[PDB]
Design a protein around this ligand. Sequence first.
Ligand SMILES: CCCCCCCCCCCC(=O)O
Lengths: 277, 238, 238, 238, 252, 61, 61, 61
Amino acid sequence: IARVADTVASGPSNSTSIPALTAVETGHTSQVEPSDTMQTRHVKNYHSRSESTVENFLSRSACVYIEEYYTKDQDNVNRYMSWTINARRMVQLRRKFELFTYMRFDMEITFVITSRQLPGTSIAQDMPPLTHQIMYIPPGGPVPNSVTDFAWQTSTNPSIFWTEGNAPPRMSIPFISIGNAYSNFYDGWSHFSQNGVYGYNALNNMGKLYARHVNKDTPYQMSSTIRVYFKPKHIRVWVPRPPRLSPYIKSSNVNFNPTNLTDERSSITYVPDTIRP
Amino acid sequence: GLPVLNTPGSNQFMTSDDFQSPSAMPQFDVTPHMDIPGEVHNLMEIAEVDSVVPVNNIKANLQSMDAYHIEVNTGNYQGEKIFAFQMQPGLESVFKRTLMGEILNYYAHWSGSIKLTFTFCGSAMATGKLLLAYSPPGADVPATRKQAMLGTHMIWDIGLQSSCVLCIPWISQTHYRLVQQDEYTSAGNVTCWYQTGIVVPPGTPNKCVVLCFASACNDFSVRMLRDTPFIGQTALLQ
Amino acid sequence: GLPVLNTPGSNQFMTSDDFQSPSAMPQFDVTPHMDIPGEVHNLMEIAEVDSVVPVNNIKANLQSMDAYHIEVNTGNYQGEKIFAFQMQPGLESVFKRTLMGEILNYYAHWSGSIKLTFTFCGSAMATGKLLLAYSPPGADVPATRKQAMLGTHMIWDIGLQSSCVLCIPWISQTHYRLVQQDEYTSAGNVTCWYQTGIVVPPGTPNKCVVLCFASACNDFSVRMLRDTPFIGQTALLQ
Amino acid sequence: GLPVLNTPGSNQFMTSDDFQSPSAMPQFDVTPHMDIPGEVHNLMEIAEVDSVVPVNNIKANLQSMDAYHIEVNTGNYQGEKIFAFQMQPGLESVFKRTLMGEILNYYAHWSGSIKLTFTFCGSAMATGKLLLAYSPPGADVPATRKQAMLGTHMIWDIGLQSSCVLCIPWISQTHYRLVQQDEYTSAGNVTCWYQTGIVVPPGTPNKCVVLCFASACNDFSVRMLRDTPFIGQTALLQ
Amino acid sequence: SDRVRSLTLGNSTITTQESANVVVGYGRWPEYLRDDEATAEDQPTQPDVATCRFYTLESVQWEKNSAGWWWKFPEALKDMGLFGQNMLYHYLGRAGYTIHVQCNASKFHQGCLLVVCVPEAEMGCSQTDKEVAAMNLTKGEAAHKFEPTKTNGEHTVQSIVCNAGMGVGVGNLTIYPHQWINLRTNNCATIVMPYVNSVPMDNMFRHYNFTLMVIPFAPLDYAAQASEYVPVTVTIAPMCAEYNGLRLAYQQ
Amino acid sequence: MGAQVSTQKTGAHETIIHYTNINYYKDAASNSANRQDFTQDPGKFTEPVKDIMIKTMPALN
Amino acid sequence: MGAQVSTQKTGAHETIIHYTNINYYKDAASNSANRQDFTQDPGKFTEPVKDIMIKTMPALN
Amino acid sequence: MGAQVSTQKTGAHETIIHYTNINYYKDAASNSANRQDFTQDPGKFTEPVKDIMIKTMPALN
Ligand SMILES: CCCCCCCCCCCC(=O)O
């Protein structure tokens, strides 16, 4: 089905046919194959590009964020999580998405929440299972300012209640973008006067995500770390582009430091001698 | 209810699974689909596009256009190797970063032929013949033109047709090779020599640039999904 | 029993899920259905109903009927802007609380046209022509009638027909816009001017009230369910 | 959802189970199948192949080819037992390590006949007749040729045909026997004697080697999968 | 002979006797917005020949040490005849564009340029800790140029060529609609770009749909007494230009 | 039910290889990935030329 | 069983999109929500007039 | 569904002995083992001779 091209058996040649000669100036990539520049044998190639599919390539859960929130109200520790959803803080997944200019797809979101008890001299407890609450707040919705804010009522905002021990919570979401496709790159501004925000943040706005412990309080300080995972499915991509070369500096723009095109070597004719009997 | 028995692997979370799951946004009206130009279906569509290869990747040119320059001069240079490199589409520093190699680094296995297109950028008056050879693994790198000539070679004659393709056939023992090529999955080497020489008229440069392009053929394919070793971080970006 | 494997997301509780569940009251005989007047099927049925808009929402009128009053006077007032505001059905303080905007605040996305109906409440002897203009995002707010006149406008002639509709067409780049509109999803502005003036006979008021109504069209629609930011509490009521 | 009730044995992990499970590598393109010579379908295909038996397994030969040597000499040797052993394909030290027995040690139950092939390696001038007897469990091991001759025997006459087969029929009470044979599942013994003697011409060796081969028949079969007691370790290898 | 070609749009016509075929965007050709893909309800305006014609920008000089140049559209055409006038008076716009880069020398000169059209060519800043200014991204028909070395500007674009000011490899820009101008065979380069964006239409001042980059991979060279002045002129013509949201002109 | 039988990916014992699927949720976004869509058209990027170029012929003439 | 196949809501890969459902409980109150009932009649609130009013005509005459 | 009924292995009450199976995963590698493939051909190892040898006859003659 997604099979690869076979190699036709070719023999000697001596004609005005010039498949090897061309002109890249046309912007046309040569469509030559081994059988065109040598004598080849017939080969029934059964290989398949099934795993090169944009679907199989991007459809794999990848971490996009991670924050920690405590249980007790001691010191200036955040007791809840806040996050302006986006996939530009994790270089791995961010680099893949940026292989294309525009994207369209549904998505499977999985959460890996783990807790712990902070070190201490006398910390003997017996806390029941910790239950967490993850609430999604689309742009404009009321934001909670405490682990007891009325906003956690989740009247209409989607929210998940998960208790430790059980399988990591998950749920799918459609294609939210108000545009016909998500934009990984936006060479424009937010204001017509050509100023303000520049790039991604200028238009993308998937809202925010908040988390917290629904448990009232813990005898001794404890903390939990939530890890968000994205897995696009039913994918569509447009306009491919040069992969990221320079390391990512900011998660709001494409700033970078002049990076080398590639690793170095002795000379253009350098090739390590691996045959030494 | 229906008597059920949970099998091992339950409640786990495999990043590469594929199950159904409840939508957090029921009856959401997705934005109408718009037909956008240049849609990609398979990554191989990208690896099949020629991209300039930095053959002259010496420390002094790692950040200049000279990295792509492959000089050729007039005068006797017989026995001199214009350039050479291993055939590691994803490991060789020369290909490692090209569109092709850049994609192979997201996979661990690869197979197929490669198209090395060479373009003469000299003047319209400069002429010459170069010998583009490819030697499969097994023996030492060609030290002389005779040794290189014994392998799969292409004699390129510079003329109106600026470019010339040197298709490196897939001559491997195994069906696939590792992108992280080792000696076992060796691919061989590619050496360029002067078939004749570069003759030029008076009042014309004596040094010319020869660009190199690399791309996959219709018989190419990757196979083992992995993370690319060309990107990382030490903390969440901000 | 049947070998089963639990998938991630099991035993969780998503407020927007939709599964079946055992009834705590088996065989309960529901009270007979009664056909009650004015049934609602879609919230848009409400957002399509005209509601008085508090255009004159200045601090001094935030609690009086003057908030809805849009005065117009007799005499030369050329070059004077009767009123103006942004086109943010759910964010603009002017629309923020109308039936329409009040509903949009339960959603994050919106799209469609809007019907701004203006009613002259002066005496039956008062006459006049007003210029109701709408300028799409891109340039500064019309400072003069000429600038406003260049955009989508409606010249309302007061007469037997008290009301006049200024339909604001949906002229956006994207299919949808955020209720929490930012500069990117700007909608534009609406400015009102004097096309001619308000002439009146002797023994008749010189100041008249002009009410403004706002509602959605048959092409309007919301999309992202969210909680409204116009209601909250600090503790359980009692 | 569908009311379900988990049965005992849920979430457990039995090394010999057999359920379906999600692939960690979706849509992986397996390497094309190649028809390789000598494919094995059933292990019995191996246990049916003759393998040299170390009948002379005395301490002094546990590491020499003499372990396989079964000497026979010229001259009067009547009443002398050439060799003997129990019929424990997997327990008897003599068979314990042969291809046959080596496989039986991966199983606890066995059944079927066995083919004991004897090959005379003397010179082409040496002649003789040997009595290969097999006595089922029940009585003491044959002390004389007469006693052995009363049981299932084969009189082998050395000649052009070097080898001779002594098929040990499956004469058991139960359908199967334990590889870890005890007295209950006894199989009997096999004793070899001189039917006549080994006559030889002048200028010819007087001692000859007789190799023994053992393999299963078309009626053989194993049954209880277990781990072999011929391999172990005290820590992870490196 | 496929070497010679002629282009005609509006009251403008371009001639060539040494071209190398014509690259057509991503296989697509400029087309007006269909009804089943439109969003703006108001009836669009289509000046046609009035705006869809060849506009020539300020020429540039190619020197032995030139590192490259770049233009941003449709911004770069804000002051070009009626095409620029519609940009001012309208909120939304949509166009095709036919890029035609000219550059002739002689059989005795040598060099190779890379004419590319990069959609959403978001660029980085010289000082990774600061931001960039529109003034440094695009300045009308005046071209910005790449530098063979690192830049330092406060809100300037990292003009270092090797990274194309995008943090990528220049040798991979071939993945975008492009053509080369190898003086020994070429004389110009043409690229027909179709409207590429994640939206049916968009503002033409706030958004820079695509960036035209002309980066030389083969340094310009020649002998003594050989014309040292080798200019590179860029001509572009909008295609299927549509406009929506008519209002008071925007004050630049 | 609305069962839909498809073909599985080749196994390590080739040369009953089909699976069944049923969607339980009302939203298409809930369905599993489309790992079996094998469409291709490199022409967009490899041959975006206006005039068809025949391999066995000169690029320019 | 008493399976009932319906149509799913459009996905992010449009322009097998159906799901199956079976009720296991005896009470209708146990069934899932009716997220697919798209009925409308704004007339009740937008045009509750006794005399039909034609848009292109004067409200009063 | 794509159910496939096969025969079970004899029980301890012999002399409805069949089971049903349905693959839920898209990859053949996910399926259960093939514990019911009973093919044999010892000839490869027991009789790899070029000239067929008849049991009731002399190996050499
Ligand atoms: C209920 C949680 C909602 C989370 C919305 C995530 C949307 C991700 C969009 C990614 C956009 C992009 O990568 O260009």
